[PDB]
């Protein structure tokens, strides 16, 4: 419905107690002008959980399409039983760092000329369908950083625990 909850507050680390220097940090998987953070395998429970998996989407060229895959609860039995995603209204609503905490922001107010298609492959452009996409504009004047959370760290299968997925979209100035 587009409405921001001004009261909502979280952190990159959530409840994992992991500091950013121990996040498993990696680049998005970039094919032409589509940058993909796929959390399907990264968040499955392991003996070493919970880890933070931080997918870095680094953009310094025009018209990049960002796609984020967050596996749905029950898509495979056991693996994602306690998975959650934030914000609920991704990609219209994102998280930005205000002081030292993450708070909700309208992406269209953050970035002029943003494309969000209401649908992805005939389905609602929303994590409830397992995947979100947006296309960044032809020009960006100011460095802009926003986040999505795909958190499986509360899924426990005996001594295996899921991981917390973070997307950091780091947009440098471009289009000059």
């Amino acid at each position, epitope marked *: 419905l587009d409405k921001i909850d001004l009261s909502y*507050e979280t*952190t*990159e*680390s959530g409840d994992t*107690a*992991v*500091s*950013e*220097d121990s*996040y498993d*940090k990696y680049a998005s998987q970039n094919t032409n002008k589509e940058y993909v953070c796929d959390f399907t395998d990264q968040l499955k429970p392991t003996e070493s959980g919970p880890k*933070v998996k931080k997918c870095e989407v680094k953009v310094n060229e025009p018209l990049i399409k960002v796609k984020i895959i967050c596996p749905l609860k029950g898509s495979v039995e056991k693996l994602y039983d306690n998975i959650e995603y934030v914000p609920k209204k991704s990609p219209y609503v994102v998280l930005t*760092k205000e*002081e*030292t*905490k993450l708070k909700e922001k309208l992406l269209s107010k953050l970035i002029y000329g943003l494309l969000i298609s209401p649908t992805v492959n005939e389905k609602e452009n929303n994590f409830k369908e397992g995947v979100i996409e947006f296309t960044l504009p032809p020009v960006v004047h100011k*460095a802009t*950083v926003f986040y999505f959370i795909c958190d499986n760290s509360k899924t426990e299968d005996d001594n295996k625990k899921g991981n917390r997925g973070i997307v*950091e979209v*780091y947009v440098e100035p471009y289009g000059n």
Partner: single-chain antibody
Amino acid sequence: QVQLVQSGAEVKKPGSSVKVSCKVSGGTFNTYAIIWVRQAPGQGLEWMGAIIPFQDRGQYAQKFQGRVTITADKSTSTAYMELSSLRSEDTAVYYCAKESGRAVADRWGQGTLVTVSSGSDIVMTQSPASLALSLGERATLYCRASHSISSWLAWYQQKPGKAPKLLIYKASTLESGVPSRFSGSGSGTEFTLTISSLQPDDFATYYCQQYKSYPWTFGQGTKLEIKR
């Protein structure tokens, strides 16, 4: 691991400006807040401001009335604090610190000694001011906030001539390595830190800090010392 290394001690004339540097190595520079906190000799902790380096603009405590400039060189992973119009009262250790995705300042520089030589703010009330106790006894520290801070409260331990050490964040979460005899409690406006049974390493000054909203504010501290 993460290391913050600050420029050396300086002696400055009244009216001069000092620019303190804070080199960050390990972890990520551009997207994490670098925070400045000072401590006048024998006095409490005072938040000065913060920068998230990609933003190319710091935020400041109104108290410093624009005397403070906080900058960052992303190309060298170095943050800077400049204080202008220096006076006697600005003699202090200036600390840089960083947050690591858990909102709290959890990595600290060694501090920079600077010797000067020829409205809506949350008030944190800490009690008691002093505690003298013996090995094996229970220590309780109290911290009241003037407005609700939910659970955004941290407890630091400070030894003489050393940076504050994070013990507890989000009111009740122990930092890695903190022993189980430490526990924190409370939400809204009333908070406690409890040491179940005091060991020799526990004697120190303790500070609570709200990180609900800027400016970050500290209690005046509890000096916990050995009973004479």
